[PDB]
Design an enzyme around this catalytic site. Structure first.
Site, PDB file in Angstrom:
ATOM      1  N   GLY A  19       0.848  -1.142  -0.037  1.00 33.83           N
ATOM      2  CA  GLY A  19       0.002   0.262   0.009  1.00 33.83           C
ATOM      3  C   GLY A  19       0.809   1.392  -0.025  1.00 33.83           C
ATOM      4  CB  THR A  20       1.581   4.000  -2.030  1.00 35.58           C
ATOM      5  OG1 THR A  20       2.208   2.739  -2.500  1.00 35.58           O
ATOM      6  CG2 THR A  20       2.460   4.939  -1.928  1.00 35.58           C
ATOM      7  N   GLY A  21       0.422   5.393   1.031  1.00 35.87           N
ATOM      8  CA  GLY A  21      -0.508   6.534   1.550  1.00 35.87           C
ATOM      9  C   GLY A  21       0.199   7.816   1.060  1.00 35.87           C
ATOM     10  N   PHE A  23       2.237  10.187   2.787  1.00 37.81           N
ATOM     11  CA  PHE A  23       3.945  10.254   3.059  1.00 37.81           C
ATOM     12  C   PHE A  23       4.355   9.025   3.083  1.00 37.81           C
ATOM     13  CB  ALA A  24       3.614   6.223   4.941  1.00 37.58           C
ATOM     14  CE  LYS A  25       7.163   1.536  -1.528  1.00 41.03           C
ATOM     15  NZ  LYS A  25       5.844   0.850  -1.732  1.00 41.03           N
ATOM     16  CB  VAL A  26       2.342  -0.016   3.883  1.00 35.81           C
ATOM     17  CG1 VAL A  26       2.100  -1.175   4.956  1.00 35.81           C
ATOM     18  CG2 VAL A  26       2.063   1.437   4.652  1.00 35.81           C
ATOM     19  CG  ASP A 133      -8.969  10.294   8.861  1.00 38.17           C
ATOM     20  OD1 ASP A 133      -7.781  10.097   7.869  1.00 38.17           O
ATOM     21  OD2 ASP A 133     -10.149  10.468   8.162  1.00 38.17           O
TER      22      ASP A 133
HETATM   23  C1  7LV Z   1      -3.908   4.633   1.930  1.00 38.30           C
HETATM   24  N1  7LV Z   1      -4.273   4.736   3.413  1.00 38.30           N
HETATM   25  C2  7LV Z   1      -3.783   5.997   3.760  1.00 38.30           C
HETATM   26  C3  7LV Z   1      -2.987   3.882   4.295  1.00 38.30           C
HETATM   27  C4  7LV Z   1      -2.988   2.308   3.705  1.00 38.30           C
HETATM   28  C5  7LV Z   1      -1.822   1.982   3.950  1.00 38.30           C
HETATM   29  C6  7LV Z   1      -1.781   0.369   3.512  1.00 38.30           C
HETATM   30  C7  7LV Z   1      -2.683  -0.409   4.345  1.00 38.30           C
HETATM   31  N2  7LV Z   1      -2.754  -1.862   4.338  1.00 38.30           N
HETATM   32  C8  7LV Z   1      -3.233  -2.482   2.769  1.00 38.30           C
HETATM   33  O1  7LV Z   1      -3.762  -1.331   1.923  1.00 38.30           O
HETATM   34  N3  7LV Z   1      -3.414  -3.534   2.449  1.00 38.30           N
HETATM   35  C9  7LV Z   1      -3.755  -4.037   1.262  1.00 38.30           C
HETATM   36  C10 7LV Z   1      -2.720  -4.791   3.583  1.00 38.30           C
HETATM   37  C11 7LV Z   1      -2.235  -4.295   4.824  1.00 38.30           C
HETATM   38  C12 7LV Z   1      -2.031  -5.292   5.657  1.00 38.30           C
HETATM   39  N4  7LV Z   1      -1.560  -4.763   6.828  1.00 38.30           N
HETATM   40  C13 7LV Z   1      -1.351  -3.491   7.312  1.00 38.30           C
HETATM   41  C14 7LV Z   1      -1.190  -3.312   8.591  1.00 38.30           C
HETATM   42  C15 7LV Z   1      -0.713  -1.954   9.266  1.00 38.30           C
HETATM   43  C16 7LV Z   1      -1.032  -0.999   8.282  1.00 38.30           C
HETATM   44  C17 7LV Z   1      -0.955   0.514   8.720  1.00 38.30           C
HETATM   45  C18 7LV Z   1      -0.675   1.437   7.705  1.00 38.30           C
HETATM   46  C19 7LV Z   1      -0.847   2.742   8.014  1.00 38.30           C
HETATM   47 CL1  7LV Z   1      -0.674   3.868   7.123  1.00 38.30          CL
HETATM   48  C20 7LV Z   1      -0.928   3.221   9.575  1.00 38.30           C
HETATM   49  O2  7LV Z   1      -0.701   4.401  10.103  1.00 38.30           O
HETATM   50  C21 7LV Z   1      -1.013   1.988  10.526  1.00 38.30           C
HETATM   51 CL2  7LV Z   1      -1.121   2.284  12.283  1.00 38.30          CL
HETATM   52  C22 7LV Z   1      -1.171   0.686  10.158  1.00 38.30           C
HETATM   53  N5  7LV Z   1      -1.736  -1.272   6.775  1.00 38.30           N
HETATM   54  C23 7LV Z   1      -1.774  -2.297   6.383  1.00 38.30           C
HETATM   55  C24 7LV Z   1      -2.310  -2.652   5.106  1.00 38.30           C
HETATM   56  C25 7LV Z   1      -4.100   0.105   4.338  1.00 38.30           C
HETATM   57  C26 7LV Z   1      -4.157   1.734   4.598  1.00 38.30           C
END
Ligand code: 7LV
Length: 321
Positions: A19-21, A23-26, A133
């Site tokens: 995933g990509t938000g 300011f962040a890449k996950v 949010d």
């Molecule tokens: C687009 N948004 C602004 C953020 C998006 C980031 C990828 C996330 N994701 C996904 O999109 N999958 C498809 C799987 C996935 C699996 N595990 C995750 C575990 C934690 C997080 C996480 C992400 C952010 Cl930005 C946080 O602050 C915290 Cl506390 C936790 N995101 C995950 C995540 C979904 C939301």
């Protein structure tokens, strides 16, 4: 930079981007010592400037919110250019996906989900925070179909369709009252599959939100309708208290006990099998190792301990590589 990663790759092997938000890449990654999968949120410090203090409040907040329905922070690693957050992996995807695949949830499936939301947000308020949010994109399912609240970058001490009227007017507000409004939007979306306030034109949607009128689909039970009205009050002083949401009659239906909002983990004793296996990997005695874990610095030891704990709960050997 390459040096920004050398500490991280000592402890994790990176898999694909998930995933990509903003300011962040996950990235999906594997914690090497336990073999447990984790999510790593990657941020570049130069790219962020003004919301660099935002990230520090997000991190400080996540260290203070350990809860069965809040995405657990395992490890904070900051380098010259990067900040890495190692987080609980939620393979079940976003609540958004669950809703849109089901078109909408029945009242029973809604309450299964909504009680977990109420649980998480009540705990957040009990710790002096507000999320600000709340929305289905910020609620993920883990592999056991348990909800996990994420993204405390906007937390106090937003997405327009979920924002309370007083925020849209640019007025002062209480964080908890704004969270309750957003949760009222969430409950509508869970049971209807669409938003109560929506418009392609933002000014028209400003006006719809501040007016507070929404369609009431015929498939909503009378009890659902009243809880919707008590949370979606334009005047924040007339919105239901979080205290009264915990044992609200609609919440209690088919359950008969209030929402358990208190954290299930607290800061109890450490798990003996975990600290024993840890000490076998660290040139230290057990008491020294128990003392190190209790400082909870969210370094690699915090991560190894918490993930060895999760791996034990999984029924797998209590062992490190
Ligand atoms: C687009 N948004 C602004 C953020 C998006 C980031 C990828 C996330 N994701 C996904 O999109 N999958 C498809 C799987 C996935 C699996 N595990 C995750 C575990 C934690 C997080 C996480 C992400 C952010 Cl930005 C946080 O602050 C915290 Cl506390 C936790 N995101 C995950 C995540 C979904 C939301």
């Amino acid at each position: 930079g390459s040096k920004d990663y050398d500490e991280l790759l000592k402890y994790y092997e990176l898999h694909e981007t998930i995933g990509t938000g903003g300011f962040a890449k996950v990235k999906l990654a594997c914690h090497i010592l336990t073999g447990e999968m984790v999510a790593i949120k990657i941020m570049d410090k130069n790219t962020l400037g003004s919301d660099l203090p935002r990230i520090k409040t997000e991190i400080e907040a996540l260290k203070n919110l350990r809860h069965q329905h809040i995405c657990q922070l395992y490890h904070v690693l900051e380098t010259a250019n990067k900040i890495f957050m190692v987080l609980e992996y939620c393979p079940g995807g976003e609540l958004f996906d669950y809703i849109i695949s089901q078109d909408r949830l029945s009242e029973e499936e809604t309450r299964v989900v909504f009680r977990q939301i109420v649980s998480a947000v009540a705990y957040v308020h009990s710790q002096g925070y507000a999320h600000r949010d709340l929305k289905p994109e910020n609620l993920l399912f883990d592999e056991y179909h348990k909800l996990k609240l994420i993204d405390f970058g906007l937390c106090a001490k937003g997405s327009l369709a979920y924002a309370a009227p007083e925020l849209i007017q640019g007025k002062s507000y209480l964080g908890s009252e704004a969270d309750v409004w957003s949760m009222g939007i969430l409950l509508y979306v869970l049971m209807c599959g669409f938003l109560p306030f929506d418009d392609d034109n933002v000014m028209a949607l400003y006006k719809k939100i501040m007016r507070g009128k929404y369609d009431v689909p015929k498939w909503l039970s009378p009890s659902s309708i009243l809880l919707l009205q008590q949370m979606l009050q334009v005047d924040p002083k007339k919105r239901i208290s979080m205290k009264n949401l915990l044992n609200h009659p609609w919440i209690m239906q088919d359950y008969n006990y209030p929402v358990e909002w208190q954290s299930k983990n607290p800061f109890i004793h450490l798990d003996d099998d975990c600290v024993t296996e840890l000490s076998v990997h660290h040139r230290n005695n057990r008491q020294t190792m128990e003392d190190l874990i209790s400082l909870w610095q969210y370094d690699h030891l915090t991560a190894t301990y918490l993930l060895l704990l999760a791996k034990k709960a999984r029924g797998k050997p209590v062992r490190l590589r």
